[PDB]
From a paper:
We determined the structure of the human MICAL1 using single-particle cryo-EM to a nominal resolution of 3.1 Å. The cryo-EM density map was clearly defined for all four domains but less visible for the linker regions, which were not built into the model. Analogous to its murine counterpart, the human MO domain comprises two subdomains of distinct sizes interconnected by two beta-strands (MOβ9 and MOβ15). A deep cavity located between these subdomains is partially occupied by the FAD cofactor, which, in the cryo-EM structure, is observed in its oxidized state with the isoalloxazine ring in a planar conformation. The interaction between the MO and CC domains is primarily mediated by the CCα1 helix, wedged within a shallow cavity between the large and small subdomains of the MO. The interface between the MO and CC domains is extensive, burying a total solvent-accessible area of 2554 Å2. A key feature of the MO-CC interaction involves a region between MOβ17 and MOα15, potentially acting as a molecular switch. This region includes Trp400, which stabilizes the FAD’s isoalloxazine ring through coaxial stacking, and adjacent Phe399, stabilizing the MO-CC interaction via a cation-π interaction with Arg933 from the CCα1 helix. In the cryo-EM structure, the CH domain binds to the CC domain. The LIM domain engages the central part of the CCα1 and CCα2 mainly through hydrophobic contacts. Given the high quality of the cryo-EM density in this region, we confidently modeled this helix within the L2 linker (residues 630–647), which we have labeled L2α1. This helix is wedged between the CC, CH, and LIM domains and plays a crucial role in the stability of the CH-LIM-CC assembly. Interestingly, the opposite face of the MO domain, which contains the deep cavity housing the FAD cofactor, exhibited minimal changes in deuteration, except for a minor helical region spanning residues 201-206. These observations suggest that the binding site for the CCα1inh helix on the MO domain partially or fully overlaps with the F-actin binding site.
Author numbering: 8 to 486, 508 to 613, 630 to 647, 696 to 752, 907 to 1061
Write the structure that this text describes.
């Protein structure tokens, strides 16, 4: 039959134009018009007797037979417009089609020309399989494979949407909305170029934007989360499908957190300075990596060091040949050269498929839904995909969170069609959206086979009232004195101590007894007799600083000499504000004491000469540096307690790494998922650290500007000075909170580092211990002697860390 051949060509097509032509021919052979909705899907299923393409109809009917859809009657009177035909746009189009609505989709492009590989969560894999992914794609997730190229996913979803009866227009670009000018008329979309009269005269009730990237409809507010400057590089190599390429195992690594030996070896051998790397064995060998500006400049990948990052990575600034050599070297070192000769795949323009991207900042919208009313007509606008939350590619959360957003948007549309008020709909949507940025395979229902539109099948302990309708009224359209409390708290804490009085916040501390009194009051029964009978001339202040640093976990901001001299009042104010914020109602102290023990176990900035300010100060060994000046001399990496050392010979700091049946299937799948979980944890830690560093830089710059303005203009009114000091104290509080969070992160980083080092050391020990009595020499004995003490030290540190964690958990469960 002609219909059978047409259906086979439709299933096996590999190009968008081929899919469209095959579907047009198939609909012509059946006397049908594409875009007829659910009725034409029923007609195709009934009138196509294939006897081998029957499991597909079973899967589609099982999916469409859920009670939530009400047999395509939940949204039978609503009209929708989807902008963009990416994976998320096609997914939401399919979801809206199943509910029984009329879906019109518009795509700017006319081809699917993206070969990059996306990672898939288990529920995403099950969801795609339930739609008949194996029929449309033979190699879909066979074995432990959990990824798919962008164009293959797009083709699969396009075939499903075409079968379900969705009208799709290609080459049309959405630009804006046409408001109704008269009563009784709906909304229309501005499209470029001039569209067919049927499309241009189409009035819709729902607008779902899935344009991804940075596109956003007017009326939506988007804010970007920034980070340290990172340069991403993606590359695709042709996969020969030979056996030798199949035994090559996939690898992944993150800087100094996960799989560090790879990065150290790669830097030592080739000179490639990377931050993270991920490799995928999909239809093409896919490599994604992160690199820094210095290495790219050194190797000639970039021409000039332009401060503007937009011009830094422009087409006129990158050298394609240098980039190709860079990527080839990184890839062939990553896979031990087992892949043989690597030959780049070709993109749409015939160039090699290697590219560079900006990985610094990610956009995200403040709200995921809006309502606009004019002449009594109401329009609901929703965001799905990258246009809602921009993903970090190495983390592999794009498809999963896009699908979750699509499900939530379809649920919102179904609630909207029921006649519920706009405010409650928006409140529920925002309540659901509040959880999107923290979604993970671990904190959702483990029964992924029961997922659906209803949020209760996906989000545990769901609260649909987490946002009240009064907080979303702006999304509906119709057409200070911290100083006084600080002084009062100091006065009330100093009270009861004999021989002291606090009348101000600047000169009362010159005596030096007040600091000791405060430290004694915070923790009772520490000391007293030594200072009373002792001289205590400028030594009381230093002792108070030392005991506060070593016991109360508060780093000093102002030197004791400046305290007694009174030449640094703002530093004293910042110190007292840290005291006030700490006990207004730890990890830093633990890290400091660990660094002190490591240092003992061996038994005006002073580096750059520019003036230090109150916020940029960082005190160590009794000396103050810029927070940004504390880096290793060789790798120029940020130093943290417990992993740095100082050489008195040169007076420099160096890091420790620079200091001179199906049972087998299920088992393998669980092992791969655990490895992916570890990598994701490390990558999330690294990303959060970069964000914290960027925020600290921004707040330090702002505080320096404020403090310089306060100092230079000494004729300002007193109230403005009070306001400036209040803002400075708020900045100090924010900086302290960020530092505490960073210390919390470094605790886990240290745990991971010691675990990895212990594993490597035991592997080395078991390698040494394989030699028998016949193979014995002084070298083996020395190796055993040198490794045993290392194992002793690491296990001692492991007991120290588990003791700290046990104490923390006991304190948490105390209350
Ligand atoms: C070049 C590129 C490379 C990527 N590489 C990776 C990678 O290696 N790993 C990874 O995890 N993620 C990667 N992504 C992101 C990945 O595509 C998304 O995570 C995921 O595909 C979600 O797609 P989306 O529909 O939200 O956005 P997209 O698929 O990017 O956008 C949807 C579509 O909307 C269309 N469109 C745009 N503007 C308009 C308009 N005005 N009118 C009509 N249609 C419009 C575009 O043609 C686009 O194809 C990449 C994205 C791009 C653009
Ligand atoms: Zn400095
Ligand atoms: Zn170093």
């Amino acid at each position: 039959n002609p219909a059978h051949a047409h259906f086979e060509s439709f299933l096996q097509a590999q190009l968008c134009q081929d899919v469209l032509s095959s579907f047009q021919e198939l609909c012509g052979a059946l006397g049908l018009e594409p875009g007829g909705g659910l009725p034409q899907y029923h007609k195709i299923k009934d009138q196509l007797n294939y006897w081998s393409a029957k499991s597909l109809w079973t899967k589609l009917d099982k999916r469409a037979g859920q009670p939530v859809y009400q047999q395509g009657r939940a949204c039978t009177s609503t009209k929708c417009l989807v902008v963009g035909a990416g994976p998320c746009g096609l997914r939401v189009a399919v979801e809206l089609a199943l509910l029984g609505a009329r879906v019109v989709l518009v795509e700017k492009r006319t081809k699917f020309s993206r070969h990059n590989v996306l990672h898939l969560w288990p529920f995403t894999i099950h969801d795609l399989r339930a739609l008949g992914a194996k029929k449309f794609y033979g190699r879909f997730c066979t074995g432990t494979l959990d990824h798919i190229s962008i164009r293959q996913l797009q083709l699969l979803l396009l075939k499903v949407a075409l079968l379900l009866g969705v009208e799709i227009h290609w080459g049309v670009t959405f630009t804006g909305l046409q408001p109704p000018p008269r009563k009784g008329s709906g909304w229309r979309a501005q499209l470029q170029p001039n569209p067919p009269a049927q499309l241009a005269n189409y009035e819709f009730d729902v607008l779902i934007s899935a344009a991804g990237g940075k596109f956003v409809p007017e009326g939506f507010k988007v804010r970007e989360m920034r980070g340290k400057l990172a340069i991403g590089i993606t590359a695709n190599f042709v996969n020969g499908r030979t056996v030798e390429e199949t035994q090559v195992p996939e690898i992944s690594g993150v800087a100094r957190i996960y799989n560090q030996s790879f990065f150290q070896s790669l830097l030592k051998a080739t000179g490639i300075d990377l931050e993270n790397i991920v490799y995928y064995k999909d239809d093409t060998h896919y490599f994604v990596m992160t690199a820094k500006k210095q290495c790219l400049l050194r190797l000639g990948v970039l021409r000039q060091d332009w401060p503007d990052t937009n011009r830094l990575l422009g087409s006129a600034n990158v050298v394609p040949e240098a980039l190709q050599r860079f990527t080839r070297a990184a890839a062939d070192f990553a896979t031990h050269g087992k892949l043989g000769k690597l030959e780049f795949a070709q993109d749409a323009h015939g160039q090699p498929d290697v590219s560079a991207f900006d990985f610094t900042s990610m956009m995200r919208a403040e709200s995921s839904a809006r309502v606009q009313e004019k002449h009594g007509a109401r329009l609901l606008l929703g965001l799905v995909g990258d246009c809602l939350v921009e993903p970090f590619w190495p983390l592999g959360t794009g498809v999963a969170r896009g699908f979750l957003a699509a499900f939530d948007a379809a649920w919102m549309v179904k609630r909207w069609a029921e006649g519920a008020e706009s405010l409650e709909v928006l409140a529920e949507r925002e309540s659901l959206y509040q959880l999107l940025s923290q979604t993970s395979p671990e904190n959702m229902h483990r029964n992924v086979a029961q997922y659906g539109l209803d949020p209760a099948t996906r989000y545990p302990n769901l609260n649909l009232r987490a946002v009240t309708p009064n907080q979303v009224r702006d999304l509906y359209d119709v057409l200070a004195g911290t100083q006084e409390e600080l002084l009062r708290w100091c006065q009330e804490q100093t009270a009861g101590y004999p021989g002291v009085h606090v009348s101000d916040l600047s000169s009362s501390w010159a005596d030096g007894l007040a600091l000791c009194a405060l430290v004694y009051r915070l923790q009772p029964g520490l000391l007293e007799p030594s200072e009373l009978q002792g001289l205590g001339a400028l030594e009381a202040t230093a002792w108070a600083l030392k005991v506060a640093e070593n016991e109360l976990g508060i780093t000093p901001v102002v030197s004791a000499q400046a305290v007694v001299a009174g030449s640094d009042p703002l530093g004293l104010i910042a110190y007292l504000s840290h005291f006030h914020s700490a006990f207004k109602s730890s990890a830093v102290l633990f890290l400091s004491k660990l660094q002190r023990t490591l240092q003992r176990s061996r038994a005006l900035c002073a580096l750059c000469g520019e003036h230090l300010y109150v916020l940029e100060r960082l005190c160590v060994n009794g000396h103050f540096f810029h927070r940004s000046c504390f880096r290793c001399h060789t790798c120029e990496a940020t130093l943290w307690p417990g992993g740095y050392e100082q050489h008195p010979g040169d007076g420099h700091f160096y890091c420790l790494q620079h200091l001179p049946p199906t049972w087998r299937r299920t088992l393998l799948r669980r092992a791969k998922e655990e490895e992916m979980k570890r990598f994701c944890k490390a990558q999330t830690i690294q990303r959060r650290l970069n964000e914290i560093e960027a925020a600290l830089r921004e707040l330090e710059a702002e505080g320096v500007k404020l403090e310089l303005a306060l100092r230079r203009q000494s004729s300002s009114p007193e109230q403005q000075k009070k306001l400036w000091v209040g803002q400075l104290l708020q900045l100090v509080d924010k900086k302290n909170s960020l530092v505490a969070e960073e210390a919390e992160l470094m605790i886990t980083v240290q745990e991971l580092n010691l675990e990895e080092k212990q594993w490597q050391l035991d592997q080395e020990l078991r390698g040494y211990m394989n030699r028998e009595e016949n193979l014995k020499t002084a070298a083996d004995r020395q190796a055993e002697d040198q490794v045993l003490r290392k194992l002793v030290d690491l296990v001692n540190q492991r007991d120290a860390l588990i003791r700290f964690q046990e104490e923390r958990r006991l304190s948490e469960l105390a209350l």
